[PDB]
Amino acid sequence: QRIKRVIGNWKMHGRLSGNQALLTEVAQGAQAVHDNVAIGVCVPFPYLAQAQAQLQGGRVSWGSQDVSAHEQGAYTGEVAAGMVAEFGAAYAIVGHSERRAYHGESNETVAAKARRALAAGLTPIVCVGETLAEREAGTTEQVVGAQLDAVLAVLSPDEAARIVVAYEPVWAIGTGKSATAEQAQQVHAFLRGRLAAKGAGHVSLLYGGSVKADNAAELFGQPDIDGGLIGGASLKSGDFLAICRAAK
């Protein structure tokens, strides 16, 4: 029995007063979700203090959407895992496809980010995923395998047991193709096998493609999908809670 999780990635959205509305609604609605679902939100850096003040003591966790590969130094604009941790955050997303694409983050850089998260007392949500070109070239397993291996290679098994992994079907996001639950399960089963070989087979594997209120039950019903890293639906409390309830 592995941990079920529904974690919202707000991405670059939110201002103080809209954040307070979403956070109150989610905290109030979360009381009605089955108690085995770990619910969390990852907010933009400046609002970590707000998320703490509003959610502290409740069942909703919070986190950042990135952390630096280093603990300190001449890295203008970057935020250290140690900084995020001081606001009682539980999570840090590392290696999101948007950052691998737009910021050029390599497999090895993501591995360093995972380690920094752990060292600071956060649970890293380690994102992996292949592009359309990669999938059509038949290299899905080589790619997401190399991404995950790079992270596992710098951790002991006991450290690896503490991560979360998220699969993003980048090939189905704004390309004209779409993913089925079965196609998701196929990659999750592959990733589960790599985790087991490391001795981290119990780690939560979250689906990070398009998750909406109408498809959550089908996706989360798959045997190796333990929940979701939710995009746009995480911005409207009704949709987000609907998704949280489907993870029972």
How many other CB atoms are found less than 10 A from the CB of residue 223?
9
Give dist(CA 54, CA 155) in Å, integer.
Answer: 34
By C-beta, is 151 or 160 nearer to its own copies? 151
Minimum Å distance from CB 182 to Na ion? 13
Residue that the structure tokens 């399960």 belong to: 185
Residue 8 annotated as binding? no
DSSP 13: -
Q: Which residue has the CB atom at the shortest distance from Na ion?
A: 225
Residue that the structure tokens 């503490």 belong to: 162
Minimum Å distance from CB 22 to its own copies? 14
Active-site entry in 98, 105, 130, 168? 168
Residue 204 annotated as binding? no
The reply on whether position 176 binds its own copies by CB under 8 A is: no
- Sequence-ordered list of residues with C-beta below 8 angstroms from that of 60, at least 6 positions apart, any chain: 23, 26, 27, 30, 39, 40, 41
The reply on whether position 76 binds its own copies by CB under 8 A is: yes
Minimum Å distance from CB 74 to its own copies? 5
The CA angle 214-222-218, to the nearest 5 degrees, is 15
The reply on whether position 7 binds its own copies by CB under 8 A is: no
Give dist(CA 185, CA 172) in Å, integer.
Answer: 15
The reply on whether position 79 binds its own copies by CB under 8 A is: yes
Residues 201-240, one symbol each (x = binds Na ion by CB under 5 A, - = not), give -------------------x----x---------------
**Residue 91 β-bridge partners:** 63, 123
Identified binder of its own copies from the candidate list 118, 231, 233, 244, rule CB under 8 A: 231
The reply on whether position 187 binds Na ion by CB under 5 A is: no
Residues 8-47, one symbol each (x = binds Na ion by CB under 5 A, - = not), give ----------------------------------------
- Sequence-ordered list of residues with C-beta below 8 angstroms from that of 112, at least 6 positions apart, any chain: 69, 70, 154
List residues forming the annotated binding site for substrate: 9-11, 174, 210, 231-232
